[PDB]
mmCIF file of C-alpha atoms and ligand atoms in Angstrom:
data_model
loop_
_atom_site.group_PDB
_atom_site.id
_atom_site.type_symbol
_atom_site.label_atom_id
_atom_site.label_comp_id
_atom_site.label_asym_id
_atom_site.label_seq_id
_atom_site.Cartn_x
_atom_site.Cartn_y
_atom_site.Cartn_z
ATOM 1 C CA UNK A 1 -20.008 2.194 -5.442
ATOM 2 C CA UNK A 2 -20.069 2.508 -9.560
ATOM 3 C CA UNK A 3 -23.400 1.543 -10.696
ATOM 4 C CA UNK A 4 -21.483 -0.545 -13.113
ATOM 5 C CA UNK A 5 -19.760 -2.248 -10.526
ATOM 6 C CA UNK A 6 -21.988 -5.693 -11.211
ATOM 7 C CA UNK A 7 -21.976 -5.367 -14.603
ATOM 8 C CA UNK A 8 -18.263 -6.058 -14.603
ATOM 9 C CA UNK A 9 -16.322 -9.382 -15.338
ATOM 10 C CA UNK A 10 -16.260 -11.146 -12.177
ATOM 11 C CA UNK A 11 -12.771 -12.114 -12.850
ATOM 12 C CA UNK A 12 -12.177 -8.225 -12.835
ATOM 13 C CA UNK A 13 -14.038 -7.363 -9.994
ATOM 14 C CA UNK A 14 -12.321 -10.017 -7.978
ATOM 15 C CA UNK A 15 -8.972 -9.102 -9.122
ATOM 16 C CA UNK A 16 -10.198 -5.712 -7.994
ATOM 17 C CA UNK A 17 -11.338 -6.947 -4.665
ATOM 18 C CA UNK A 18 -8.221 -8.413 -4.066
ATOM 19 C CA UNK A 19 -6.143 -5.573 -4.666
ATOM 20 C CA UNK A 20 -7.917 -3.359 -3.168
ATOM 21 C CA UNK A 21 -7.442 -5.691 0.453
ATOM 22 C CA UNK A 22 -4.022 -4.875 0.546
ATOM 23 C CA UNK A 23 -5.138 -1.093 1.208
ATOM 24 C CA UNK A 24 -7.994 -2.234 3.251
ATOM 25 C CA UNK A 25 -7.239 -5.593 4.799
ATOM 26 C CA UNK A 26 -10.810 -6.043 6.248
ATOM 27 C CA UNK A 27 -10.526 -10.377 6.843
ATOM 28 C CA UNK A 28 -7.634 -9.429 9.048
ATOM 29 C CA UNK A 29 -7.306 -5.882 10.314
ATOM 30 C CA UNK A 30 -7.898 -6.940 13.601
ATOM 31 C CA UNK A 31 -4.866 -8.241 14.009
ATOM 32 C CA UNK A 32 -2.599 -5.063 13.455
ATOM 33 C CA UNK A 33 -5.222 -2.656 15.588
ATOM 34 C CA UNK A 34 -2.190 -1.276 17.662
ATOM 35 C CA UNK A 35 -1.042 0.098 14.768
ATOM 36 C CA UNK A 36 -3.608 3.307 15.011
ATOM 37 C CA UNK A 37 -1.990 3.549 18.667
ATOM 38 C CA UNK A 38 1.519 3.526 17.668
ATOM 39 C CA UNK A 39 0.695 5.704 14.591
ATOM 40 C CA UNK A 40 -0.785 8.541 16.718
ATOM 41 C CA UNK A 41 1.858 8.579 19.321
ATOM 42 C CA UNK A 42 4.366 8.881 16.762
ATOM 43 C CA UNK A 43 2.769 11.135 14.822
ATOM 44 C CA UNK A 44 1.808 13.654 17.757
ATOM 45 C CA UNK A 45 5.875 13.586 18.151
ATOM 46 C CA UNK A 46 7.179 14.287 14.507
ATOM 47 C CA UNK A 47 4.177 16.611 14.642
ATOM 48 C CA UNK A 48 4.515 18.077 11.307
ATOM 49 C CA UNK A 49 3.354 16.397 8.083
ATOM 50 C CA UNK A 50 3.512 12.904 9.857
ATOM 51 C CA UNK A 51 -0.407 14.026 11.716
ATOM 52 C CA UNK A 52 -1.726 14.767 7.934
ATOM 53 C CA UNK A 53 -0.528 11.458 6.532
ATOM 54 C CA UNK A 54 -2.194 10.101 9.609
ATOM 55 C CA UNK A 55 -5.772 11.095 8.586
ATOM 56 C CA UNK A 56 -4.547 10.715 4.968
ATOM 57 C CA UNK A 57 -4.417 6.867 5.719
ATOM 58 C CA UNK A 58 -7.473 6.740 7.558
ATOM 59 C CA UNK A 59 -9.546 8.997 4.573
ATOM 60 C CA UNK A 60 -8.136 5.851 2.512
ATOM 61 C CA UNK A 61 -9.528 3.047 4.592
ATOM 62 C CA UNK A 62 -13.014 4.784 4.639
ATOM 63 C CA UNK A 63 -12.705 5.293 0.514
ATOM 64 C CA UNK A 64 -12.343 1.278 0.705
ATOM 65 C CA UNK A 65 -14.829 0.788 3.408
ATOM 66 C CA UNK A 66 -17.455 2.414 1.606
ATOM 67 C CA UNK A 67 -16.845 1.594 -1.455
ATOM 68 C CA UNK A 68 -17.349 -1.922 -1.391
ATOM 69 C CA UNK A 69 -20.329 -1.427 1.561
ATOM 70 C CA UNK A 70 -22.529 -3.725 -1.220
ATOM 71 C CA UNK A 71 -19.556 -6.181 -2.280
ATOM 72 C CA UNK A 72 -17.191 -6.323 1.218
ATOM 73 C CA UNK A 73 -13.598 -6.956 1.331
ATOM 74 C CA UNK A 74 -13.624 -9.395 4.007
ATOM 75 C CA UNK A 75 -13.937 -12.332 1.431
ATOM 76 C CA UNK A 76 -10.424 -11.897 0.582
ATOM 77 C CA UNK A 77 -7.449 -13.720 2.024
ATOM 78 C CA UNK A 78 -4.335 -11.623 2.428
ATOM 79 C CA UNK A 79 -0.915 -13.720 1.598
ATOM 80 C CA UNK A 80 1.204 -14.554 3.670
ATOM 81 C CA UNK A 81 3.935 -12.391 2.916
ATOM 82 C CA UNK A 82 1.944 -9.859 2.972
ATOM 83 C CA UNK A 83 0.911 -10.474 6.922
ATOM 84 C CA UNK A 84 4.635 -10.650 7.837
ATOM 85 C CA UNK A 85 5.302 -7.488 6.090
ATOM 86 C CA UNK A 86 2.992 -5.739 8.778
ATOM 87 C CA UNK A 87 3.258 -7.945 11.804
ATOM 88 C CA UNK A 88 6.760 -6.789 10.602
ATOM 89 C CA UNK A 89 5.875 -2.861 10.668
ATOM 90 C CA UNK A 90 3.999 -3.127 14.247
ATOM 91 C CA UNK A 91 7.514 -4.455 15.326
ATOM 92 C CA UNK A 92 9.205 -1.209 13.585
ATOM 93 C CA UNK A 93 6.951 1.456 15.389
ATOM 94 C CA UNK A 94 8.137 -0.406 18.713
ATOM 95 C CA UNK A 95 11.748 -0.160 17.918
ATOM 96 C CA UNK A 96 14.141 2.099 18.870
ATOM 97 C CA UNK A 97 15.190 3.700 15.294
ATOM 98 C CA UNK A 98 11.586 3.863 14.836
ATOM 99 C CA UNK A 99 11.678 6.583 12.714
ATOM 100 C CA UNK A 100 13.682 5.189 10.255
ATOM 101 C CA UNK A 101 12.241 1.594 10.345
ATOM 102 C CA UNK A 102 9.139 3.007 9.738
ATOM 103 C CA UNK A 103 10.360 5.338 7.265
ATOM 104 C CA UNK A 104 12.627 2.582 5.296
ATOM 105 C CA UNK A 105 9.835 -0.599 5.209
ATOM 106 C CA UNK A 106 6.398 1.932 5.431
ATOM 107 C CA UNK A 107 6.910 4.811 3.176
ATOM 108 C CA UNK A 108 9.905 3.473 0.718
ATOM 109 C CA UNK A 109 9.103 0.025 0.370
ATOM 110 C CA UNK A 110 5.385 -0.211 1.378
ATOM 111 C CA UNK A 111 4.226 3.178 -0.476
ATOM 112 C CA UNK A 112 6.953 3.570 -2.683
ATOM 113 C CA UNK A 113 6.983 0.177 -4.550
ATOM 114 C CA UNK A 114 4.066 -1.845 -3.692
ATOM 115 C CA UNK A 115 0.963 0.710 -3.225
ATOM 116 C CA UNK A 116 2.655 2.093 -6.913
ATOM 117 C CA UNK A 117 2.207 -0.503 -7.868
ATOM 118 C CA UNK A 118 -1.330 -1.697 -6.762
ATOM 119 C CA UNK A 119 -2.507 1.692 -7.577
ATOM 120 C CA UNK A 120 -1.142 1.625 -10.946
ATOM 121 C CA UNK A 121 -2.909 -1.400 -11.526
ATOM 122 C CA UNK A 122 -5.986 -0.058 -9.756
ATOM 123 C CA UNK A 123 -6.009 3.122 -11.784
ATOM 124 C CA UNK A 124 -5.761 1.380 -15.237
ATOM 125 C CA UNK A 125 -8.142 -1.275 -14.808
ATOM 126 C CA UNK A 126 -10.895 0.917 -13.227
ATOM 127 C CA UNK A 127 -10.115 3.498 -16.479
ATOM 128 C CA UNK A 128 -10.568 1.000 -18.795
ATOM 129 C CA UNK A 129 -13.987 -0.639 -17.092
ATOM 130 C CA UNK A 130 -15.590 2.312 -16.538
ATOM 131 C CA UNK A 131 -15.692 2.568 -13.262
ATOM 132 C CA UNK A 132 -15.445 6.676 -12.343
ATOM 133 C CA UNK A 133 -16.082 6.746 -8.988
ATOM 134 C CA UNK A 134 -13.698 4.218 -7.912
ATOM 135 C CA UNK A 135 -11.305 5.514 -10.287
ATOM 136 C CA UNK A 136 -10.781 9.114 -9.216
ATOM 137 C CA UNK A 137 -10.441 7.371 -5.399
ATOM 138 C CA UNK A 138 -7.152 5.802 -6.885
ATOM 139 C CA UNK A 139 -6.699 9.170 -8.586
ATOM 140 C CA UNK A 140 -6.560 10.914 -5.472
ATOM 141 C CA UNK A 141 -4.928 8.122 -3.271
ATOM 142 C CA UNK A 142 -1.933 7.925 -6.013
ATOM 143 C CA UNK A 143 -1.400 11.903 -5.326
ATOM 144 C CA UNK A 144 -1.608 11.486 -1.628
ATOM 145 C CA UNK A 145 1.331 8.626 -1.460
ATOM 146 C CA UNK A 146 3.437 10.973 -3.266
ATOM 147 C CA UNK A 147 3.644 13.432 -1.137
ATOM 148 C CA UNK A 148 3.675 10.325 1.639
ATOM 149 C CA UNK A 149 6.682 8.953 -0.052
ATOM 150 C CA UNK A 150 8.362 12.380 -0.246
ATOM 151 C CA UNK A 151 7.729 12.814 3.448
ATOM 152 C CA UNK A 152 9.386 9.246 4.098
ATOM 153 C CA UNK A 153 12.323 10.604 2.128
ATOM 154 C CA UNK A 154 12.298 13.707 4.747
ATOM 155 C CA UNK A 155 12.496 11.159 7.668
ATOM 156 C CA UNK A 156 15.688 9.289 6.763
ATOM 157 C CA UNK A 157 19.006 10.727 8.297
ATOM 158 C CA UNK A 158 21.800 7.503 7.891
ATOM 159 C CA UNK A 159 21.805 6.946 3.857
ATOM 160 C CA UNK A 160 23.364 4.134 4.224
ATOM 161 C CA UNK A 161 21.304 2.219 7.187
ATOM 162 C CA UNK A 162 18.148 3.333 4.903
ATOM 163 C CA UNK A 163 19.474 1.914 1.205
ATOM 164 C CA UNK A 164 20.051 -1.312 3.084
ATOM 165 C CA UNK A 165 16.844 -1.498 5.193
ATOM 166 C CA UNK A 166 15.144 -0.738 1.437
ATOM 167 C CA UNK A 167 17.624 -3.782 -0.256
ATOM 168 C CA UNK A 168 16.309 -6.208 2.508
ATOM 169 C CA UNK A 169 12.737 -5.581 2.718
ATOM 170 C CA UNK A 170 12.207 -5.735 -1.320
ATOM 171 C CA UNK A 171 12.343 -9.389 -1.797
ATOM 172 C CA UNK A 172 8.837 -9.430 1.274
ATOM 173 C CA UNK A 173 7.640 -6.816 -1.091
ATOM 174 C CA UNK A 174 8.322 -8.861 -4.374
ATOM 175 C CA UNK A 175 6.822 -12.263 -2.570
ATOM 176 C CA UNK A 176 4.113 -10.773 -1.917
ATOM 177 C CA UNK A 177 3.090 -9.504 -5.905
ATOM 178 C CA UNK A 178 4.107 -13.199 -6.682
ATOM 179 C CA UNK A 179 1.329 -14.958 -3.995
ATOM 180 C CA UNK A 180 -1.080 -12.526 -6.116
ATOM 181 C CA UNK A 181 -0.493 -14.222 -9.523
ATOM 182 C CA UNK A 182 -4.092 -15.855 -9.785
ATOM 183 C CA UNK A 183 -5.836 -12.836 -8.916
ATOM 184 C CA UNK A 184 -4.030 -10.339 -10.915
ATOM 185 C CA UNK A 185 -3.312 -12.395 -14.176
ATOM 186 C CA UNK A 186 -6.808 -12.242 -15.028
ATOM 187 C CA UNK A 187 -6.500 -8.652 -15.155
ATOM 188 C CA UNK A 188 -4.238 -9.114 -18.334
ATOM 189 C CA UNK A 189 -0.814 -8.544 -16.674
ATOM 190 C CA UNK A 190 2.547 -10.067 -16.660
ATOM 191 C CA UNK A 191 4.092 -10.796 -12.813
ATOM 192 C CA UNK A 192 7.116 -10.802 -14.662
ATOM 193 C CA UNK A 193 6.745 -6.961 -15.807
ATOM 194 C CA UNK A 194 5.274 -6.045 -12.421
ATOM 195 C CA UNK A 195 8.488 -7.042 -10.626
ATOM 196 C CA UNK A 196 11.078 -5.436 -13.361
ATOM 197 C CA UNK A 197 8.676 -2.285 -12.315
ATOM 198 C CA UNK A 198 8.857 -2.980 -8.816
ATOM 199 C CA UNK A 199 12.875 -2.916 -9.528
ATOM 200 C CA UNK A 200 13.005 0.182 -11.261
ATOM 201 C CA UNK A 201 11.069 1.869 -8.310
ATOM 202 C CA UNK A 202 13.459 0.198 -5.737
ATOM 203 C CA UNK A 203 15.868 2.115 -7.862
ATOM 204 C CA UNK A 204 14.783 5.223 -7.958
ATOM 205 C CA UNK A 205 13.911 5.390 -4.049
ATOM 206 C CA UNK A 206 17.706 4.169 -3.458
ATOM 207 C CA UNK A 207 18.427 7.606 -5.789
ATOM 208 C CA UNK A 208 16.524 9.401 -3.937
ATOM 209 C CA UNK A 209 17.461 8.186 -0.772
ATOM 210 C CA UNK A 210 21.193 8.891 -1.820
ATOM 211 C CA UNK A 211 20.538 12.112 -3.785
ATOM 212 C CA UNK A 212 19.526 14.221 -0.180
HETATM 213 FE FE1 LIG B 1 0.230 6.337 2.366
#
């Protein structure tokens, strides 16, 4: 953890904290633990990639876990929407066009517009309070879900089953940036500018999506 860590607003740190739960949900993880099951099954299938982004994920939740070690997560209520989105993906990995449930509301809409958008925020606001250590771990994370997005893309067959799936998960992904306003305000940005970015990147994944 930064040695600067304390030495930080609290406001910041807890708009940190709070943030950083959604990529470490420690008061409630518990509650999706079949999710490492159905993740290794499916990724010892697809067996390419897909066993990479596996540990990828997990390297994450240890960055997080240690981390805060001396300021823990587990204070931090998730929002609601936010619990339905994965109570929602632990439903997907069970489905029969797993692949491209998973790939539609995991890697479009869960890395491709929220965690950019968490790790944007992350990245800026640990840049601009010093914190270096817990900076270059968004660094690093941001460069990972590209290439986690880009293997999402790979995943999708049916353009058109995907762009939909995307169009009706985004308003669960904009709901949950909303329930957030208390906590990220502080940090000195606009909810309304967050979702016109969250648009743009529902955009640009539809592109892509389309653009195969
Ligand atoms: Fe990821």
């Amino acid at each position: 953890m930064d040695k600067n860590w304390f030495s930080t607003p609290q406001e910041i740190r807890e708009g940190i904290k709070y943030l950083s739960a959604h990529f470490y949900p420690a008061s409630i993880m518990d509650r999706w633990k079949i999710l490492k099951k159905l993740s290794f099954e499916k990724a010892k299938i697809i067996a390419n990639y897909s066993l990479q982004q596996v540990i990828e994920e997990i390297e994450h939740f240890d960055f997080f876990n240690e981390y805060f070690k001396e300021d823990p997560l587990t204070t931090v209520r998730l929002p609601p929407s936010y619990i339905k989105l994965f109570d929602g993906l632990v439903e997907d990995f069970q489905s029969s066009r797993w692949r491209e449930n998973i790939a539609t509301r995991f890697h479009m809409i869960t890395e491709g517009v929220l965690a950019t958008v968490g790790l944007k925020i992350l990245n800026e606001t640990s840049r601009k309070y010093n914190l270096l250590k817990f900076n270059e771990g968004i660094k690093r994370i941001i460069e990972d879900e590209a290439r986690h997005v880009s293997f999402g893309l790979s995943l999708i067959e049916d353009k058109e089953y995907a762009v939909k799936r995307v169009e009706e998960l985004f308003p669960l992904a904009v709901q949950i940036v909303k329930e957030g306003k208390d906590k990220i305000e502080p940090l000195g940005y606009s909810i309304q500018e967050l979702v016109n970015l969250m648009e743009e990147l529902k955009k640009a994944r539809i592109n892509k999506i389309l653009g195969s």
